[PDB]
Coordinates of C-alpha atoms and ligand atoms in Angstrom, one line a residue:
X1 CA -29.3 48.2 14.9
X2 CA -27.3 45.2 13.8
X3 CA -29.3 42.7 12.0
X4 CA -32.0 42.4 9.2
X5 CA -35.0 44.0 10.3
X6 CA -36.0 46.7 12.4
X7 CA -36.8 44.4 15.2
X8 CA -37.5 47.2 17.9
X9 CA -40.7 49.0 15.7
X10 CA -41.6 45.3 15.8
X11 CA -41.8 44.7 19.0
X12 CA -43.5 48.4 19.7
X13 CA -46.2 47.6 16.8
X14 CA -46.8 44.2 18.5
X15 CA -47.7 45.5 21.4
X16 CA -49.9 48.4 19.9
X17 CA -51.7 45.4 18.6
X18 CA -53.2 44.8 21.9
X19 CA -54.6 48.5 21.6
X20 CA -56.7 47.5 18.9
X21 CA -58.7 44.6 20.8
X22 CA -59.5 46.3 23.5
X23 CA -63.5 46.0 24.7
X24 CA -65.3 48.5 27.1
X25 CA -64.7 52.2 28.3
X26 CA -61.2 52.9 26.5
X27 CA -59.0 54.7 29.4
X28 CA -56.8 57.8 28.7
X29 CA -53.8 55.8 27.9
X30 CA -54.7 54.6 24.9
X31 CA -52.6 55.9 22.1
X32 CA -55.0 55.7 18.7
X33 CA -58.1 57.5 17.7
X34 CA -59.9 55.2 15.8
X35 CA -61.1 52.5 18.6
X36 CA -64.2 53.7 21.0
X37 CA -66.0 52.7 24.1
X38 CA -67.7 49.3 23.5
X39 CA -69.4 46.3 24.9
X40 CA -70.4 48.8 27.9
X41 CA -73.3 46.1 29.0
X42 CA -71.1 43.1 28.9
X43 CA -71.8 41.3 32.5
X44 CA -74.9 42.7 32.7
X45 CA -77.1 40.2 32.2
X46 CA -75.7 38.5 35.7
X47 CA -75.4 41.7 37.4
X48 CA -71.8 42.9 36.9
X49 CA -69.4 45.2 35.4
X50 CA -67.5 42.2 32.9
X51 CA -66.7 45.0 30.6
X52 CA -62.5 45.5 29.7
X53 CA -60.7 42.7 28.5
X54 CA -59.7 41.9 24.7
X55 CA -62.3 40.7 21.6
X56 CA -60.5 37.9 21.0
X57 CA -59.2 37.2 17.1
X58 CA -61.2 39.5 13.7
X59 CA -64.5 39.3 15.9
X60 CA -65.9 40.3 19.1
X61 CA -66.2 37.7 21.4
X62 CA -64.6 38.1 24.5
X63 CA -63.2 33.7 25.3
X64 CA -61.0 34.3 28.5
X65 CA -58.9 31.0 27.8
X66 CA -57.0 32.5 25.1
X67 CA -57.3 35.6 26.5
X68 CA -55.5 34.6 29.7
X69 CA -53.0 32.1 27.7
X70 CA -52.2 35.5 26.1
X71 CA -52.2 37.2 29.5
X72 CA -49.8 34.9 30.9
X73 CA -47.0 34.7 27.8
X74 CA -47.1 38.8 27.9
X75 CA -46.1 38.8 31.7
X76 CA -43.5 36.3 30.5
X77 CA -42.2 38.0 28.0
X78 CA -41.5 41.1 30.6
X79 CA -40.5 38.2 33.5
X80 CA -37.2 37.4 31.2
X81 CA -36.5 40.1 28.9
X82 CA -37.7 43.0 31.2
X83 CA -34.3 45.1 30.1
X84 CA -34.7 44.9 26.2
X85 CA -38.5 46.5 27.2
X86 CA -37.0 49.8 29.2
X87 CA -34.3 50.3 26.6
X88 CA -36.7 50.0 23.9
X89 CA -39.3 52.1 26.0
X90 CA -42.2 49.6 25.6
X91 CA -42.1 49.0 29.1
X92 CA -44.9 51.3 29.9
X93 CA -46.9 50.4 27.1
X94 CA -47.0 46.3 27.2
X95 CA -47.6 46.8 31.6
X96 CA -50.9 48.7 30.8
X97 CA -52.1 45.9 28.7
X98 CA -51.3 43.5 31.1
X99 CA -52.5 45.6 33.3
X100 CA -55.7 45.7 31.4
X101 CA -56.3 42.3 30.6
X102 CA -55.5 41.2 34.3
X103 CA -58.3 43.8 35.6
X104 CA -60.8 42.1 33.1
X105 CA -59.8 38.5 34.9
X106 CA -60.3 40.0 38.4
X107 CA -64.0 41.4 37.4
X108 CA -64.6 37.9 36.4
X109 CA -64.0 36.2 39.6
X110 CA -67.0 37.9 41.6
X111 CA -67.0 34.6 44.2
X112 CA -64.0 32.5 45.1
X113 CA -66.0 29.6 43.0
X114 CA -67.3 31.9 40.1
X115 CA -65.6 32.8 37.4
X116 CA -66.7 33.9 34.5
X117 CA -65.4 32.7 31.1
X118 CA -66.7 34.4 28.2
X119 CA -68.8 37.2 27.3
X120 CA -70.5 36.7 23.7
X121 CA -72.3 34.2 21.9
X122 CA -70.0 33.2 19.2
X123 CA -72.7 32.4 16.5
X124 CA -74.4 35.6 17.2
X125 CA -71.5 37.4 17.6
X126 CA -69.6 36.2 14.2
X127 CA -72.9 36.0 11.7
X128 CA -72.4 40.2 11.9
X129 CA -69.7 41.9 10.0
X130 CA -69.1 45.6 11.2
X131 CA -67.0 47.4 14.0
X132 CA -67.2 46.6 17.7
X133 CA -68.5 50.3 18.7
X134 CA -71.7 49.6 17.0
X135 CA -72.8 46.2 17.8
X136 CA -76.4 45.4 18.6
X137 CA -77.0 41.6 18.9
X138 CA -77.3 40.3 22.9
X139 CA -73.8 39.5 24.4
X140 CA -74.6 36.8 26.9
X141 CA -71.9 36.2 30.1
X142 CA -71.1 33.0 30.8
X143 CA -69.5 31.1 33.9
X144 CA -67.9 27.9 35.6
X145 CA -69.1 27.4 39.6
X146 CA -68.3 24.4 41.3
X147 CA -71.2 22.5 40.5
X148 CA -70.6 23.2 36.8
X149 CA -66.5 23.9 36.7
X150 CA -63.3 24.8 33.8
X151 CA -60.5 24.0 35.1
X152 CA -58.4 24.6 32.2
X153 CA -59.6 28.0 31.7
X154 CA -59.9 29.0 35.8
X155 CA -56.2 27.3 36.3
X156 CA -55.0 29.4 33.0
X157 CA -56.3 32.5 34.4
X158 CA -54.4 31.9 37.8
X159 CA -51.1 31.5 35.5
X160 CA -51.9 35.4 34.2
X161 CA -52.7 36.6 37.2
X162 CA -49.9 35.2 39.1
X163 CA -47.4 36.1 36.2
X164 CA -48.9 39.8 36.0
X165 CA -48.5 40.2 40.6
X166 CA -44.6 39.3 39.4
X167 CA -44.2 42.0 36.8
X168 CA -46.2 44.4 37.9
X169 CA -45.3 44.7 41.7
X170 CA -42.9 47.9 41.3
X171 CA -45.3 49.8 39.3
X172 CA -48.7 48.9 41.4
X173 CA -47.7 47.2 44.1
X174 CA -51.4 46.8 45.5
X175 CA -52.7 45.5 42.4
X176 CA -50.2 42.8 42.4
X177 CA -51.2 42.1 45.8
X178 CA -54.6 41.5 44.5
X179 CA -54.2 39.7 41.1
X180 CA -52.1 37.6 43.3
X181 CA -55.3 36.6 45.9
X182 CA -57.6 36.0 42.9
X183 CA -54.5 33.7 41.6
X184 CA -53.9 31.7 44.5
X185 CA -58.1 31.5 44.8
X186 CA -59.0 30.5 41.2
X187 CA -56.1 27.5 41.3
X188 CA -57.7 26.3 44.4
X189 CA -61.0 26.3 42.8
X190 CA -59.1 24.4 39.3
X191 CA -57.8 21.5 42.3
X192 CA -60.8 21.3 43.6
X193 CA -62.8 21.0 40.6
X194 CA -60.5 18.9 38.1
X195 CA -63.4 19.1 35.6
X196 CA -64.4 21.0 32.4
X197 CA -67.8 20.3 32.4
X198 CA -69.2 23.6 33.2
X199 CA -67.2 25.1 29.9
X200 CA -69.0 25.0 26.6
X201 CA -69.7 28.5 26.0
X202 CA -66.3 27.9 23.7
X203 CA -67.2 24.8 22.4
X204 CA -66.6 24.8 18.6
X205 CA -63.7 27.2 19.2
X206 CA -61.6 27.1 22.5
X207 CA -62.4 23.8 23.2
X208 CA -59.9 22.5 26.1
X209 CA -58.2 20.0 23.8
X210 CA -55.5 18.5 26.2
X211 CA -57.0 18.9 29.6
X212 CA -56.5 20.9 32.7
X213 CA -53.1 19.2 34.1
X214 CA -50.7 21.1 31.2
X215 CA -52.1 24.2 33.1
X216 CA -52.5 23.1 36.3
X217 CA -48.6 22.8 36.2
X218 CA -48.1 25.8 34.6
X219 CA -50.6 27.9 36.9
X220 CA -48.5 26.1 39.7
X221 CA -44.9 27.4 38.9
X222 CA -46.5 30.9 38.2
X223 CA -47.7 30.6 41.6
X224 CA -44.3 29.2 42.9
X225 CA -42.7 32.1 41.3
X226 CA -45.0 34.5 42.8
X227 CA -44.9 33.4 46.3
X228 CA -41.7 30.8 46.9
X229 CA -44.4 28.9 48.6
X230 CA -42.8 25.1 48.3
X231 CA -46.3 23.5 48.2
X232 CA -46.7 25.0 44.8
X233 CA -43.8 23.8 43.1
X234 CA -44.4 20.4 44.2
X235 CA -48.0 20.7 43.0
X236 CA -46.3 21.7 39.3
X237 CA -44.0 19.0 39.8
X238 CA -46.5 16.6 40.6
X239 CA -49.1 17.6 37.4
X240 CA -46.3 16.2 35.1
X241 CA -47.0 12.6 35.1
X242 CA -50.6 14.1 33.8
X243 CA -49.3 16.1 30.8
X244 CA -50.2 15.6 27.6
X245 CA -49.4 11.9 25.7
X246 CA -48.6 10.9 22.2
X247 CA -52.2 9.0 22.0
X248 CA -51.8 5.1 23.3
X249 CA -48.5 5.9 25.0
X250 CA -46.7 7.4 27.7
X251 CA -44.4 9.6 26.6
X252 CA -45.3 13.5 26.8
X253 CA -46.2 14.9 23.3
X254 CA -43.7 16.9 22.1
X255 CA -44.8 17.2 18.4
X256 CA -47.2 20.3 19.2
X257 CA -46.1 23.6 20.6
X258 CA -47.0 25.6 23.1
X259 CA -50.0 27.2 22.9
X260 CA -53.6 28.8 24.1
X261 CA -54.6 24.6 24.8
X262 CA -51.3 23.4 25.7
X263 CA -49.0 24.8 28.2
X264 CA -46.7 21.7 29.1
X265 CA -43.4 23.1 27.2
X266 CA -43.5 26.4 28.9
X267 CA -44.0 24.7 32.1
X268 CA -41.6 22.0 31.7
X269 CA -38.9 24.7 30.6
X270 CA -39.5 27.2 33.7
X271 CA -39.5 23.4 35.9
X272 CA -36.0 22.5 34.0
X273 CA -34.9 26.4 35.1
X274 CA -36.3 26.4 39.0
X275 CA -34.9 22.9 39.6
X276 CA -32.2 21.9 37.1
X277 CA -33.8 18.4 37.0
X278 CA -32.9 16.2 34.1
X279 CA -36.6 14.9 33.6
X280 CA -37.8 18.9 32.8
X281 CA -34.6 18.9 30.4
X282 CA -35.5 15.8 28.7
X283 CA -38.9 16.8 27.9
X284 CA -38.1 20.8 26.5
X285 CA -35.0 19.5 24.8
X286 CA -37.6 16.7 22.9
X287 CA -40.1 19.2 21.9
X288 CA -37.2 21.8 20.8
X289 CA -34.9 19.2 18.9
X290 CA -38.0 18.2 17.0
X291 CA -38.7 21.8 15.8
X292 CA -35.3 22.0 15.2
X293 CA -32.3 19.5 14.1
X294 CA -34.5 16.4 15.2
X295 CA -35.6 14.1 17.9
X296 CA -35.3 10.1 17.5
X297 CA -34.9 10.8 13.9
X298 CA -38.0 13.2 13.4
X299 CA -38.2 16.8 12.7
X300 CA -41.5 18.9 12.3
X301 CA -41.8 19.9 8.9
X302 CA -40.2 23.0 6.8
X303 CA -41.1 24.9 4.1
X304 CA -39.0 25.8 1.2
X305 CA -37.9 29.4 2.3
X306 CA -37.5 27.7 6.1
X307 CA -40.8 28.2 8.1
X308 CA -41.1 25.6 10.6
X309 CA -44.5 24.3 9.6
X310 CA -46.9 22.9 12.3
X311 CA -50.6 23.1 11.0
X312 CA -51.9 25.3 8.0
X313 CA -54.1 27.8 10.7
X314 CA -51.9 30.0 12.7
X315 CA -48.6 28.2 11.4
X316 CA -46.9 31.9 12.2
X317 CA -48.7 31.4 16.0
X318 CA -46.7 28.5 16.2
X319 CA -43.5 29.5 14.9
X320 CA -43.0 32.1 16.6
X321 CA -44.1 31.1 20.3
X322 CA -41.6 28.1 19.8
X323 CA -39.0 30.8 19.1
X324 CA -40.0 32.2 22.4
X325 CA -39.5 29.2 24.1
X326 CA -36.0 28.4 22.1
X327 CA -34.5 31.4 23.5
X328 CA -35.7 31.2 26.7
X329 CA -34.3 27.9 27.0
X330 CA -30.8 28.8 25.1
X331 CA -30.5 32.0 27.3
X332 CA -30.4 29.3 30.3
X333 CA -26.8 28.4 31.7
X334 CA -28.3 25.2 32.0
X335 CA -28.5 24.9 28.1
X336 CA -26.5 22.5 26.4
X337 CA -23.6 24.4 24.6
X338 CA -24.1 23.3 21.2
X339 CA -27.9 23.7 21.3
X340 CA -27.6 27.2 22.6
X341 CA -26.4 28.2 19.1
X342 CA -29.0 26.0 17.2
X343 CA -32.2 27.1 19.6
X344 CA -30.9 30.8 19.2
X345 CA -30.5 30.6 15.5
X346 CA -33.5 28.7 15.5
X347 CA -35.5 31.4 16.9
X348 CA -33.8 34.2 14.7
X349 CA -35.0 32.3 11.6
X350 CA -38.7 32.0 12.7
X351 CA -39.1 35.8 13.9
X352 CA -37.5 37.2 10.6
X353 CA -39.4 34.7 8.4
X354 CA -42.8 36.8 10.4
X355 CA -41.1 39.9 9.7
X356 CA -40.3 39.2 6.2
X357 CA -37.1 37.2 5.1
X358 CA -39.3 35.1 2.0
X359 CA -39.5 38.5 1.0
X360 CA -42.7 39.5 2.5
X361 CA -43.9 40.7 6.0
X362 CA -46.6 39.0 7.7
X363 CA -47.2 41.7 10.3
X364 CA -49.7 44.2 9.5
X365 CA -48.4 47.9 8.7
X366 CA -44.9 46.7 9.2
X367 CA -42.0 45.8 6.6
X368 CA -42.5 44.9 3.1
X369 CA -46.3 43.9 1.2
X370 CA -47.8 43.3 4.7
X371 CA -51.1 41.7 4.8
X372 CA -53.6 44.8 3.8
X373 CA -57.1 42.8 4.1
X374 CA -56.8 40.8 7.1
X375 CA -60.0 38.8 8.8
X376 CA -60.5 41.4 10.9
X377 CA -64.4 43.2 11.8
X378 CA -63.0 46.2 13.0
X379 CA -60.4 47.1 11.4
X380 CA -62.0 47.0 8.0
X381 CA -65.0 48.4 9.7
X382 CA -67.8 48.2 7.1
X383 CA -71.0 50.0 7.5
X384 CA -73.2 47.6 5.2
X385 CA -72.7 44.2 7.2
X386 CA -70.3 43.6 4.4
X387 CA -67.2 41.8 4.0
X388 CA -66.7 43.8 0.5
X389 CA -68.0 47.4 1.6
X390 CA -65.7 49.2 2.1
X391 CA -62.9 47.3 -0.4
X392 CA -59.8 48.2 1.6
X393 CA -60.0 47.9 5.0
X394 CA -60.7 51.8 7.2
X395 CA -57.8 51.4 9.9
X396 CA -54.5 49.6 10.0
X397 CA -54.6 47.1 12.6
X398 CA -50.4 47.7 12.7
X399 CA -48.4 44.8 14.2
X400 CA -51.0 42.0 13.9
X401 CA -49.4 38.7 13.2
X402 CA -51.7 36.7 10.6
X403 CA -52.1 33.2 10.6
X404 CA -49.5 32.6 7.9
X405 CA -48.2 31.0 4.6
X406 CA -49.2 27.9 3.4
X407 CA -46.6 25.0 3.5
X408 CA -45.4 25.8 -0.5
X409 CA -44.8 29.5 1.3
X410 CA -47.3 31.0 -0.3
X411 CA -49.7 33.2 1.1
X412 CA -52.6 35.3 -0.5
X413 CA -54.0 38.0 1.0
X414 CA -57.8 38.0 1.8
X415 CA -60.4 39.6 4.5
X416 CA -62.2 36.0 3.8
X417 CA -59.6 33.7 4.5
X418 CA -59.9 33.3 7.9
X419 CA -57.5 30.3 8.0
X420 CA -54.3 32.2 7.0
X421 CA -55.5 35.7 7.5
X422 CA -56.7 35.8 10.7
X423 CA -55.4 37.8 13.8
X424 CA -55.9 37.2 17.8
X425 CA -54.5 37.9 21.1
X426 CA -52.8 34.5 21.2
X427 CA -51.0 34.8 17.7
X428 CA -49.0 38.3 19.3
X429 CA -48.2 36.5 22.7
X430 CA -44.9 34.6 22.2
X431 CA -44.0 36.7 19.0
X432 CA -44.3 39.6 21.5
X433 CA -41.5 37.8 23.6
X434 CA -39.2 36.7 21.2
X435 CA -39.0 39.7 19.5
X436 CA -38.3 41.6 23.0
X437 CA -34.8 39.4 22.2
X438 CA -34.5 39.8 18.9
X439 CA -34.4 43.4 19.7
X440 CA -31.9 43.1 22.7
X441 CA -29.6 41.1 20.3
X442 CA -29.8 42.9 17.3
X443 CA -31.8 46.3 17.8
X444 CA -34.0 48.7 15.7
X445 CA -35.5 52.0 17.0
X446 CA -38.9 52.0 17.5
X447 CA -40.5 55.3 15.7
X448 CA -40.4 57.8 18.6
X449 CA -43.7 58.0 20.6
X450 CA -45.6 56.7 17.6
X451 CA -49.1 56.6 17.8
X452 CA -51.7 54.7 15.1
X453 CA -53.4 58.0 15.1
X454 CA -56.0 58.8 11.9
Ligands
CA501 CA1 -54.4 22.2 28.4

């Protein structure tokens, strides 16, 4: 324990966040007593167990591209910092939910072409306000075929399912063996396909923004990673001259981050570490110059108490996932010297400002005046379809990262301010990472065996 925060109950919290989520028949593993069995009919309105998986955000339905964005950066965060998870004993705990999640994807691929994309209307699903156990509105299952495809989400759920036959190969080596058929099958079914024409189930909220080449790549070098198979590294390679654009030109856009839409920058800085290339180099340094000291005379924006400020919904989201990638990247030999020490303290800055450095955390039931009312259904679990009844929320959804501050810092602290105080699966998933390193760095015990247990 060496540095400001008590970075390992962080990351042990973070994880436990994942708990909360969960949809269907809970298994024995599960560590709290306040989530049940729910969505038990999901699929079954086109003949199939869909049930498992994770309710996306403060509502209920189930919208597999962030859910497998999320999928992917967990497996990621155990593919580099695999060590700071066993000494921390969180090892156990952040494999079952990948574990889980990756199940969930494997249900959803009941025919090589076939893949199923999301279980729940959203417009039913959010005009109800009460916990997940007692829903009664229909939960429709939709999915992509060939004749009606998603690319972006089928390709994304090959980069989770390849990641997950990586990590969790020593612990079930025959459900590696299978995530890793259903991976190699749904990006074969993305190539073939290169269309999202099929997905609109999301439309309105996961909408695929930059297209399907960002995860094409990215699916690719998971795949690469998975299998040393030659074809798919050139495949990632190839995808590049695809990625993303600053609109009217052709140079990459590396004024975003990386993200449930956008994958490029995670891509381009496993590419840079697989083949040493300047290109891959050129394009991560870009993107994490101009989060940090600046690119071509242009940094991203920071608030006064140093929050690197992309967009006023999920700016924490952001932050943090870019401080994933900064020390990924600065952990690499191949790192420039000088911005080893800028990415690293980079990333140190963003994962305490979550934790509470203006002098407030942002993680629920961790640290100092964390958020107490965030957007959250089932959490707050009311019994009157009530976003007022009960007036303090019934459960502690610990280690939920909310969307954050506003650019002035300032932050309120409201279950109807779905902007700032919402929660979701992709929000945890690079936070989960970086503070895997923040932990091996500086440390902080986790609270032995905890359990959010009412
Ligand atoms: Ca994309």
């Amino acid at each position: 324990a060496s540095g400001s925060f008590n970075y390992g109950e962080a990351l042990q919290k973070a994880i436990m966040f994942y708990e909360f989520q969960m949809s269907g028949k809970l298994p024995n593993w599960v560590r709290n007593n306040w989530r049940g069995d729910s969505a038990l009919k999901d699929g079954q309105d086109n003949g199939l167990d869909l049930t498992g998986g994770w309710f996306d955000a403060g509502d209920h339905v189930k919208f597999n591209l962030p859910m497998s964005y999320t999928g992917t950066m967990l497996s990621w965060a155990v593919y580099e910092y695999k060590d700071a998870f066993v000494k921390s004993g969180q090892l156990e705990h952040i494999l079952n939910q990948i574990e889980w999640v990756n199940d969930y994807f494997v249900k959803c691929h009941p025919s090589k072409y076939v893949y199923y994309y999301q279980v729940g209307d959203g417009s039913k699903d959010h005009a109800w306000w009460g916990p997940a156990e007692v829903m009664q509105m229909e939960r429709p299952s939709f999915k992509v075929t060939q004749s009606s495809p998603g690319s972006t989400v089928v390709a994304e759920t090959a980069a989770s399912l390849a990641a997950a036959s990586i990590v969790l190969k020593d612990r079930n080596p025959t459900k590696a063996a299978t995530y890793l058929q259903h991976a190699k099958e749904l990006y074969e079914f993305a190539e073939v396909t290169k269309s999202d024409a099929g997905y609109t189930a999301a439309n309105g909220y996961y909408n695929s923004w930059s297209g399907f080449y960002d995860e094409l790549s990215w699916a690719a070098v998971w795949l690469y990673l998975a299998t040393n198979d030659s074809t798919y590294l050139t495949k990632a390679e190839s995808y590049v001259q695809n990625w993303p654009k600053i609109s009217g030109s052709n140079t990459i856009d590396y004024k975003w981050a990386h993200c449930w839409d956008d994958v490029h920058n995670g891509a381009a800085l496993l590419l840079a570490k697989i083949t040493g290339k300047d290109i891959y180099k050129q394009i991560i340094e870009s993107h994490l110059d101009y989060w940090t000291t600046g690119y071509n005379g242009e940094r991203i924006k920071y608030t006064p108490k140093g929050l690197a400020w992309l967009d006023q919904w999920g700016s924490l989201r952001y932050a943090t996932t870019t401080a994933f990638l900064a020390f990924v990247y600065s952990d690499w030999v191949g790192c420039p010297s000088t911005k080893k020490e800028i990415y690293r303290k980079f990333g140190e800055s963003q994962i305490d400002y979550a934790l509470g450095s203006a002098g407030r955390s942002f993680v629920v039931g961790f640290g100092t005046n964390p958020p107490k009312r965030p957007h959250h259904r089932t959490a707050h679990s009311s019994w009157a379809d009530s976003q007022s009844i009960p007036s303090y929320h019934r459960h502690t959804l610990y280690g939920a990262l909310v969307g954050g501050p506003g650019s002035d810092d300032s932050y309120t602290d409201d279950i109807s301010n779905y902007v700032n105080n919402e929660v979701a699966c992709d929000y945890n998933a690079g936070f989960v990472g970086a503070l895997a390193k923040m932990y091996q760095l500086y440390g902080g015990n986790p609270i032995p065996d905890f359990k959010a247990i009412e």
